[PDB]
Amino acid sequence: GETTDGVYRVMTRRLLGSTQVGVGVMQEGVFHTMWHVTKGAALRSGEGRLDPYWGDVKQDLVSYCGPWKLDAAWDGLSEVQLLAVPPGERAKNIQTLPGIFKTKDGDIGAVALDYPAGTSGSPILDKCGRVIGLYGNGVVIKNGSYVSAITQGKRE
Amino acid sequence: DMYIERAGDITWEKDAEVTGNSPRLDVALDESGDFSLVE
Numbered sequence: 001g002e003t004t005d006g007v008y009r010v011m012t013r014r015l016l017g018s019t020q021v022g023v024g025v026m027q028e029g030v031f032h033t034m035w036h037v038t039k040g041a042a043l044r045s046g047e048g049r050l051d052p053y054w055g056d057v058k059q060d061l062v063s064y065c066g067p068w069k070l071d072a073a074w075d076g077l078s079e080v081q082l083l084a085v086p087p088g089e090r091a092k093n094i095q096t097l098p099g100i101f102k103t104k105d106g107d108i109g110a111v112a113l114d115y116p117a118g119t120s121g122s123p124i125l126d127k128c129g130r131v132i133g134l135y136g137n138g139v140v141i142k143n144g145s146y147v148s149a150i151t152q153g154k155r156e
Numbered sequence: 157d158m159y160i161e162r163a164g165d166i167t168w169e170k171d172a173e174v175t176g177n178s179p180r181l182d183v184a185l186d187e188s189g190d191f192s193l194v195e
């Protein structure tokens with residue numbers, strides 16, 4: 001199937017018509033997405049099959065064909081871009097200054113942008129075009145707005 | 157049966173639309189990977 005680096009939609013034909021359940025990143029031959037998008041199922045790419053290789057429900061991440069390859073991190077100061085891929089709509093870059101999720105185990109950058117659930121797995125990038133995490137695991141705050149963590153895995 | 161379809165390159169775009177605020181929130185992450193607000 002298609003192994004070219006880039007951002008991809010994750011589709012299913014199990015529901016009505018063809019439905020976009022999420023998004024992912026192909027980098028160095030490995031497909032990266034959030035666990036809640038695929039639930040760890042195998043994926044098809046044309047006539048080819050992508051099998052899960054690593055995953056973790058708590059991190060809400062999964063990699064296919066190989067180990068997690070994305071290791072860039074938000075520098076804690078600069079604006080970033082969400083490369084949003086919404087269902088049925090063209091990929092679009094949105095620039096924003098992240099906020100912060102403060103936890104008992106440390107602080108994480110967060111992006112206050114609200115897209116449909118099927119946009120989960122869209123990449124967040126730095127000024128060098130490096131993926132610093134994936135969008136789509138977050139919280140609903142006081143005024144009812146959605147804020148996503150910038151979720152990044154560990155490159156072994 | 158899930159399948160993937162290419163949607164684009166991963167590149168920073170100059171003069172992209174700039175929006176979104178930057179909230180600082182106290183959150184908790186449970187064993188199921190769900191975030192919740194801590195008050």
Ligand SMILES: CCn1cnc2ccccc21
Nearest residue numbers: 114115116117120136146
């Ligand atoms: C409140 C749920 N929600 C809203 N927008 C989303 C985008 C990705 C994942 C979940 C989302």
